[PDB]
Design a protein around this ligand. Sequence first.
Ligand code: HEM
Length: 152
Amino acid sequence: AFVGLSDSEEKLVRDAWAPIHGDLQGTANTVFYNYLKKYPSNQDKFETLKGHPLDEVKDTANFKLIAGRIFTIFDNCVKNVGNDKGFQKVIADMSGPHVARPITHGSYNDLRGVIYDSMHLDSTHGAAWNKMMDNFFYVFYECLDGRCSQFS
Ligand code: HEM
C-alpha cells in the first residue's frame, strides 16, 4: 500500500536525489544506456530504438529524449515527495501510455535497480529512497491494473 514519508525522510530523499537533480539529462543518458546494456531484451520495447545496435543509438537525440522524459518523471516525483496526491498524480498521468505496453514488472523493477545502484546510497538515505520507490510502484502498478482512480 501507499505509505507516506515523514518530513525527515522527505529531506533524505531530496538530498539523495540532489546529485542526479543537478545533472538530470547526463544521469538519464548513462542510466538508460546501462539499463539497456545489462538487460538488452528491453531495447526492443522502445520502437524508435528497435533494430539498431545500442552503441549506435546511444548518441541520438531520440535516445536522449526517452531517457530524459523518464528521469523528468522521477524528478517531479521527488519534487512532490511531500505531497502524496501530487506525487500520485505525476505517476497516474505517466501510467496511461504504459497500460497497453507489453512490459513486465521485471523490466520496470530492473530499471529501479539500475537507478539504485547508480546512487550508491548509505542505508539511511537508501531506506527513505526505497520508501518513495515502493510508493512509486504501488501507484504505478495499481494504475496499470486499472485502479488509478483511487488516487484521484
Ligand atoms: C518505471 C519508470 C518509468 C518512467 C517514469 C517512464 C516514463 C515515461 C514517459 C514520461 C514516457 C513518454 C510519454 C509516453 O508514455 O509516450 C515514456 C514512454 C515510453 N516508455 Fe516509459 N517509463 C518508465 C519505464 C519504462 C520501462 C521499464 C519500459 C520498458 C522497457 C518503458 C517503455 C516505454 C516506451 C516504449 C515508451 C514510448 C516510446 C517512445 O516514446 O518512443 N518505460 N515513459
